[PDB]
Amino acid sequence: PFPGSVQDPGLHVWRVEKLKPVPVAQENQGVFFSGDSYLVLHNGPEEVSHLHLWIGQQSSRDEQGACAVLAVQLDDYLGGRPVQHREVQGNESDLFMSYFPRGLKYQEGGVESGFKHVVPNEVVVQRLYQVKGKKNIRATERALNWDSFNTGDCFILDLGQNIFAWCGGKSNILERNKARDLALAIRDSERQGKAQVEIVTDGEEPAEMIQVLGPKPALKEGNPEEDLTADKANAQAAALYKVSDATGQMNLTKVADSSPFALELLISDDCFVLDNGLCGKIYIWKGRKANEKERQAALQVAEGFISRMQYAPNTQVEILPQGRESPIFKQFFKDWK
Numbered sequence: 203p204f205p206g207s208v209q210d211p212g213l214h215v216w217r218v219e220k221l222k223p224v225p226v227a228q229e230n231q232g233v234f235f236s237g238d239s240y241l242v243l244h245n246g247p248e249e250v251s252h253l254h255l256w257i258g259q260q261s262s263r264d265e266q267g268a269c270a271v272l273a274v275q276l277d278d279y280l281g282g283r284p285v286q287h288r289e290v291q292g293n294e295s296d297l298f299m300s301y302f303p304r305g306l307k308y309q310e311g312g313v314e315s316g317f318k319h320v321v322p323n324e325v326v327v328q329r330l331y332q333v334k335g336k337k338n339i340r341a342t343e344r345a346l347n348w349d350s351f352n353t354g355d356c357f358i359l360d361l362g363q364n365i366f367a368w369c370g371g372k373s374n375i376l377e378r379n380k381a382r383d384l385a386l387a388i389r390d391s392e393r394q395g396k397a398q399v400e401i402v403t404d405g406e407e408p409a410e411m412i413q414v415l416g417p418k419p420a421l422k423e424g425n426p427e428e429d430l431t432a433d434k435a436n437a438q439a440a441a442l443y444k445v446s447d448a449t450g451q452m453n454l455t456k457v458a459d460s461s462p463f464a465l466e467l468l469i470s471d472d473c474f475v476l477d478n479g480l481c482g483k484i485y486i487w488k489g490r491k492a493n494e495k496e497r498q499a500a501l502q503v504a505e506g507f508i509s510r511m512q513y514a515p516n517t518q519v520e521i522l523p524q525g526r527e528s529p530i531f532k533q534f535f536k537d538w539k
Contacts, residue, residue, distance in 0.1 A: 203275055213301055214243040218269040223276075230315060233307040236260040236291055239269035241276060243284065244301055251284040253277055254298050259291040260310065325499065326362040328414065328455040331384070333358060339380045345441070345459040347467075348415055353404055354424035356381035358388070362451065363397050364410055365389055371404040372424070414455070437461045439480050440533060445500040446472040452495065454503055463534040470524060473500035476533065479513040485531050486521045497521075 205225050208214055215226035218239045226240070234240060237260040245251035255273050257266050277284050289298045291308060299306070331341035333356045341358055344350035351357060353370035356377045365388055367381040382401055389397040402408065407418060429436065442458040448471065457467050457474070468474060470489040473496045477484050484507060486500045504519045522531055532538035 203272075204279065208243065208276070208280065211247050212245070214241075216241045218265070218272055221268055221272075223272050227315070232302040232304055233309060234258065234291070235309045235312075237310070239266045241269060241272060242298070242301065243276070245284070251280060252297070253280075253284040253286045254289050254295075254301075255286065256289050256294075256298070257291060259308075323452060325452045325454055325503075327360075328362065328453055329360045330456075331358040331360070333377060333381045333384060335380070336376075339384065341384050343456075345456040346414055347458055348419055348421070349458075349460065352422040352424060358385045359411060359414070360385075360388055361410060361414060362453070365397055365399045366402045366408070366411060367399070368402040368407065368411070369404060370421070373404075435460065440476065440478040442467060443475045443477065443503065444469070444472050445475060445496050445503060447493065447495055447499075448472070452499055454499075462536075465534045465538050468524075468534075473497055475500050475504050475507070476531065477504070477507050478533070479507055479511060479517050482517065483530070484508070484513075484517055484519050485528075486519065487527065487531075488521060488523045490524045 204216070204223055213231075215231050216223035217226050217235065218224075218241065223241055234256060236258040238258045239261045240256035240258075242254045242256055243251065244254070253273060253276055255266075255269055257269075261269075273286060277286060287295060287298065289295055294306070328346055330344045330346040330350055332344045332350065333339065333341045344357075346359070351368070351370070353372045356367060356369040356373050358381060359366040359368060365385045367378070367385045369378045369381060378401065382399075385399050385401075389399050400408065402411065404421070407415075412418065427436070438461055440461075441456055442463055444453075444455045444457045444467075446453055458464070463476075468487060468489065471491045472489050473492050474487045474489075475484065476487065484504045486497075486504055488497055488500070501519070501521075507513070508515060508517055520528065520531075522528055527538075529539065
């Protein structure tokens with residue numbers, strides 16, 4: 203029941219937690235929480251071994267009992283060779299004391315070391331929806347990428363505090379209004395507080411709309427290919443997301459949901475999460491000039507993906523720094539490699 207490598211040379215320290223002897227962090231040794239009891243084992247191998255039972259002053263009697271029991275669990279695993287001593291807090295032994303040069307530090311109450319103030323920072327999810335339905339209206343989430351837009355329809359860009367009803371040139375005044383409504387829906391209905399809605403016309407996009415999508419290209423006419431709303435897309439089901447706090451916020455944006463991804467999507471100042479969780483892996487690409495929070499966050503959304511979509515909880519989350527990308531990972535247009 204012990205970390206096992208106890209025969210190894212030197213001094214070993216463990217804080218009896220519940221009934222489990224936890225190895226005391228090598229740095230932290232010499233500081234004893236008085237509410238607990240400890241097992242400190244000093245053996246100079248080609249010398250004698252000494253198992254010392256340190257008793258916290260604030261340690262309950264029987265919480266000491268358990269430690270005593272752990273002592274023998276140990277002494278036994280070492281064939282009785284060890285010499286055992288019951289060191290009380292504050293009245294230790296010259297030999298025990300000799301284990302700690304610097305000296306001894308006793309703590310009371312307080313929180314375990316490393317205790318942290320855990321704050322759930324908001325993450326703004328930028329979404330793009332494609333409005334459809336002459337009669338009854340229904341908007342479908344699309345990836346925030348110009349490949350998603352066409353001139354015949356209206357789209358809703360929910361970019362956090364700013365929401366846009368972008369309307370293609372060849373779209374109706376009607377679709378424009380449904381779009382306007384759905385957008386108002388979000389702002390208002392969907393948790394009111396502070397969000398400004400703006401109707402945008404094909405060609406006159408605002409600065410934000412470009413900071414997100416990038417310089418506008420030429421867009422696709424109306425409805426091409428011969429399938430219906432039957433298939434998700436055409437081929438597979440892998441999606442690419444971007445994680446960046448560049449705005450002082452932390453935003454997650456689906457930047458692609460197509461088959462061959464464009465390498466241009468991978469920006470060096472961010473982290474991305476290429477979700478292939480459906481058939482196996484969920485990669486995380488760490489761009490050279492990205493920060494820790496972005497890295498830490500990308501991990502968290504890869505987990506949020508496994509939950510949300512119900513992937514085998516034992517799906518592999520592979521991190522890949524930039525340049526050091528795995529060959530499989532290169533699920534991008536050609537030239538990736």
